[PDB]
Design a protein around this ligand. Structure first.
Ligand SMILES: [Cu+2]
Ligand SMILES: [Cu+2]
Ligand SMILES: [Cu+2]
Ligand SMILES: [Cu+2]
Ligand SMILES: [Cu+2]
Ligand SMILES: [Cu+2]
Ligand SMILES: [Cu+2]
Ligand SMILES: [Cu+2]
Ligand SMILES: [Cu+2]
Ligand SMILES: [Cu+2]
Ligand SMILES: [Cu+2]
Ligand SMILES: [Cu+2]
Lengths: 282, 282, 282
């Protein structure tokens, strides 16, 4: 009786741009002039095909490389396989997804479903080190039929020391009301390992971050080590068993949190108030 | 026919102190003058509520922050939410736990059960870097009804380069007799990633460290990467299939083990002897 | 109808040598003069016993230490337990394995099955830092009855910055034809954490890297953080859903991949061609 994903299998078309931003960053967007860091969420159902008409509006070569989804070598997004895009150029990248199922040999083919991500592979170096650092990364979600759908999805990227390329002490913060079903996509990039920690909430360390029932032995956690290009996701009920509050999330590596890269999960009562949080003190 | 945890649901009261130790460390204890590093184990059943009458006997502010368990924002243990404790002060922290169960929307709420930990959040920095470094950390276990109970529980904390804040070449060692059911709570703190390795024994990488039966596909391991504020636990049968012996455990990062931070799991025959281990050579 | 492992339980005998190589490395082999880095794969069935007649042909002490399998303390491979081997010496190491099963107390004993590894424990330091760095490491696979068997098994070791001790830009590459069932054993050694990434393919994060059916909630991944002495393995169908191609694998830590330690999974059509791969350009 929660909302759930339907069966997939449609062909989808989408336009994407890589742009240099006024402050020197680089971002992806669905419209020229509306690039963001992280780039926009792409969400499909297992079985869907996605044709991305990608335009590089920058003055250097750029590409689009995706984790997890099915792509032929011509949509690798690498210079080696001649899959990047010249300045001002356009290229159609195709990502496919499949449902799980029994193979002819009796084995089980896993589906595409999961929390994934896309990023540049040619800016700065042949592994996209400069593009990733500048902001060319974004999330991808592939739903299995029957997966629970959230009220809202927030993307948190640990990129080197930053969260979502933001300066220390600037969040990002996310807001919810007690009881909302909130989804988090958690991606890591760059040079360092991290440990993602969330106060007041916990999730299962498995594909969906949710336990299906009493037979799932997955660890329930509130702290998870991650490294460059790791992605996972989960859903929580905001404030469940703990109430409204300004619930911190941050990397738990002590020098990293001490740098001031922290955010708040601001869980409100219906009247918008948050116990112990005065907005004028923030 | 092994002992198992009963159904929870009782209200428990406990006193805790933070104290400066004569050697400059800081520790938690259940009694004044009996602080330890790591702090004392707290063990409850899912459904229990714990009211901790906490007294800060130090000359600087200190707090108590817990992973995993349910707490309202007023027991956050952070300065931001005005949840720390002035020098000489007292505060009651409340931790709650819940059993798993079906929500009204048909989804499955995960329970509190697991291997968790508590630590300071305000000594030295606003993330407790100095308190953690000085020794203000300890383990928490939440049992699910029917969980197997051990003969004994040992806590191993990788804190920066140390084990349990001890100097190189000083253990800690733990002792058992062949056949004992031994539980390990494994916590990591500080700045570095580690890989916990145990000779002669292995466990399952899931919630309890134990496989329930033949249908659990979890990896069976003897080596596990960890990062700051990670916690996991497991149970082993001492010497099972391998016999008595001085079984090393250590971080497998080569420069870390080469520093001499290592311990021994001393598994004895009934007569107390250990093959290949002469106590006078140690 | 894929090939599967039979029930184990045989006693096996094998000879192994540690040798200094002409270029200054050190390797294990099954025959004098045929040491390799990584050392040769050892593969057994749960229940098998392996007696290894090990000869150290080097001028320094060396040993053989294994993860995961059952060994008594006399086959620890450590100097502390007098289990290493003098220059020119010989020693028989015994590794045992067991099937999973119900204990007398009603609990479930996990079997030995998994992806494991062996390495030196005394060259350079008392934890084998020099031996490991020089190349004394190799893979071990223990099969459970009914496990799916591959067409071929490839071993990938992240040893400090190198792959299999090879220089940057020298692979190693592995070849397959579209449709082959390919097994990867992935081991990490040394000082650093890594993230193993494979283009165009994905696997399950569980014991076998394969989902048994629709009830397994394990995350499906193409990127995995690892640390020193971690081991895991998986099987993929070469080119499944993605076609022939030169599919990169590499560490995704950006400075590591930028050093040029990368390899190719060269997936061919039957005529041996690879789209977008010209052999003369490589
Ligand atoms: Cu790549
Ligand atoms: Cu961090
Ligand atoms: Cu916390
Ligand atoms: Cu990537
Ligand atoms: Cu915190
Ligand atoms: Cu370590
Ligand atoms: Cu070992
Ligand atoms: Cu913490
Ligand atoms: Cu060891
Ligand atoms: Cu690496
Ligand atoms: Cu990739
Ligand atoms: Cu080892």
């Amino acid at each position: 009786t929660a909302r759930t994903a339907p069966a997939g299998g449609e062909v989808r078309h989408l336009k994407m741009y890589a742009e240099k931003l006024a402050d020197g960053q680089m971002g992806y967007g669905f419209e020229k002039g509306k690039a963001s860091v992280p780039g926009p969420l792409i969400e499909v159902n297992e079985g869907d095909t996605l044709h991305i008409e990608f335009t590089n509006t920058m003055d250097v070569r750029a590409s689009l490389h995706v984790h997890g989804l099915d792509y032929e070598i011509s949509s690798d997004g690498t210079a080696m396989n001649k899959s990047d895009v010249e300045p001002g150029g356009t290229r159609t990248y195709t990502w496919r997804t499949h449902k799980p199922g029994r193979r002819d040999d009796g084995t089980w083919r896993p589906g595409s479903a999961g929390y994934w991500h896309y990023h540049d592979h040619v800016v700065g170096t042949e592994h996209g080190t400069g593009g990733i650092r500048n902001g060319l990364y974004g999330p991808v979600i592939v739903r299995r039929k029957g997966d629970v759908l959230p009220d809202a999805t927030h993307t948190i990227v640990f990129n080197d020391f930053t969260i979502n390329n933001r300066k220390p002490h600037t969040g990002p913060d996310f807001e919810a009301t007690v009881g909302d079903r909130v989804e988090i996509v958690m991606i890591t990039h760059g040079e360092y390992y991290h440990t993602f920690h969330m106060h007041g909430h916990r999730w299962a360390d498995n594909r969906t971050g949710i336990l299906t029932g009493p037979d799932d032995p997955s660890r329930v956690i509130d702290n998870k080590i991650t490294g460059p290009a790791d992605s996972f996701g989960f859903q929580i009920i905001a404030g469940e068993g703990v109430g409204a509050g300004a619930w911190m999330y941050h990397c738990h590596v002590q020098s990293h949190s001490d740098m001031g890269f922290v955010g708040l999960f601001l869980v409100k009562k219906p009247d918008g108030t948050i116990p112990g949080y005065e907005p004028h003190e923030h």
